[PDB]
Ligand binder design. Structure first.
Ligand SMILES: Nc1nc2c(ncn2[C@@H]2O[C@H](COP(=O)(O)OP(=O)(O)NP(=O)(O)O)[C@@H](O)[C@H]2O)c(=O)[nH]1
Ligand SMILES: [Ca+2]
Ligand SMILES: [Ca+2]
Ligand SMILES: [Mg+2]
Length: 166
């Protein structure tokens, strides 16, 4: 079947694994469990087509930035996640996008900017500023909550569609 190599990237703690676990396993990891590198392969039906999601869940850890070039090379589409209650993760997310473009020698690589944790009250990143960043890059912006599942399928399936229409 058609396969989509998705990579989830972003600062530590933004909810990369929670987004993936919510998508693939229909539940929210309310727990501390840092990722090194994790891979999920789930066969889904998206707009009537059977396809294999091959999702690589990466580490936000401040080191491990050598293992990062290798999965950016192989990755087909990228979920670029920050948390709407963590301005630093937003500020850091431009650096991931830049590294994706450098490692893939392209600025037309399918990407979705994801503002996660949108259930929380103490938001520190306004949707308007996330909008501008996504617009400045030519990529959609989608807010998610891995806790309530809001926007989760939307974020991942839009990424698949960005790949399909690329
Ligand atoms: N309220 C809320 N908490 C969330 C959400 N997503 C993740 N969290 C919480 O935030 C923490 C970090 O989640 P996690 O998915 O492990 O983040 P990560 O980006 O995968 N971390 P790492 O880079 O270390 O692998 C956990 O306590 C998790 O339950 C969300 O959508 N809403
Ligand atoms: Ca290069
Ligand atoms: Ca181009
Ligand atoms: Mg994780």
């Amino acid at each position: 079947m058609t396969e989509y190599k998705l990579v989830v990237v972003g600062a530590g703690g933004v909810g990369k694994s929670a987004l993936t676990i919510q998508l693939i396993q229909n539940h929210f990891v309310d727990e501390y469990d840092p990722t090194i590198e994790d891979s999920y392969r789930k066969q889904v039906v998206i707009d009537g087509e059977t396809c294999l999601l091959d999702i690589l869940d990466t580490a936000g850890q401040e080191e491990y930035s050598a293992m990062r070039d290798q999965y950016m090379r192989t990755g087909e589409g990228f979920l670029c996640v920050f948390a709407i209650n963590n301005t630093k993760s937003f500020e850091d997310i431009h650096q991931y996008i830049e590294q994706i473009k450098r490692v893939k020698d392209s600025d037309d690589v399918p990407m979705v900017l994801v503002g996660n944790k949108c259930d929380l009250a103490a938001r520190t990143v306004e949707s308007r500023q996330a909008q501008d960043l996504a617009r400045s890059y030519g990529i959609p912006y989608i807010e998610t909550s891995a806790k309530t599942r809001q926007g989760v399928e939307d974020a991942f399936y839009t990424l698949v569609r960005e790949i399909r229409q690329h």
